[PDB]
Amino acid sequence: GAASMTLTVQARQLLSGIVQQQNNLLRAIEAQQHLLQLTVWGIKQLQARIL
Amino acid sequence: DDDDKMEWDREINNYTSLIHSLIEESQNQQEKNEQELLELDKWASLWNWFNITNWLWY
């Protein structure tokens, strides 16, 4: 019970916070990608009307 | 072409709301992670003193 339990327990908690936080950032990037393709599409319609 | 503009605006506003939520979730998870970490800098440094202190073998 040497408080190394206590010590790694938080570090266990941290890599857990860090790993979720990378899923968060990944999901943000994916939604940004979608937003990006809508703006591209949008721009390709404005081109394909300027003829 | 009258009902396609709308769908673009629909999807525009939905992913924009989704990105906003995701950054919000990340801003709070980052707050949490820096606390968890501040608190580890301490636990380690703490025990890293009783150790060095009592005597330092090896």
Author numbering:
A (entry chain N): 531 to 581
B (entry chain C): 624 to 681
Quote the study on this structure:
We assembled the extracellular domain of gp41 from two fragments containing residues 528 (lacking 16 N-terminal gp41 residues including FP) to 581 (FPPR-heptad repeat 1, HR1) and residues 629 to 683 (HR2-MPER) (gp41528–683). Gp41528–683 was crystallized in space group P63. The structure was solved by molecular replacement and refined to a resolution of 2 Å. The crystal structure composed of residues 531–581 and 629–681 plus 5 N-terminal Flag-tag residues reveals the six helical bundle core with FPPR and MPER extending in a helical conformation resulting in an 88 Å-long rod-like structure. Instead the FPPR region splays the inner core apart starting from Leu 545 (a position). The FPPR-MPER region is only stabilized by few hydrophobic contacts between adjacent chains, including interactions of Gly 531- Leu679, Ala 533- Trp 670, Met 535-Ile 675/Asn 671, Thr 536/Leu 537 - Trp 666 and one hydrogen bond between the carbonyl of Ala 533 and NE1 of Trp 670. A striking feature of the structure is a ∼90° turn of the MPER chain at Asn 677 which positions the remaining residues including Trp 678, Trp 680 and Tyr 681 perpendicular to the rod. As a consequence, Trp 678, Trp 680 and Tyr 681 are exposed towards the membrane and well positioned to insert their side chains into the bilayer. We thus propose that the structure represents a late fusion intermediate state rather than the final postfusion conformation, although the latter possibility cannot be excluded.
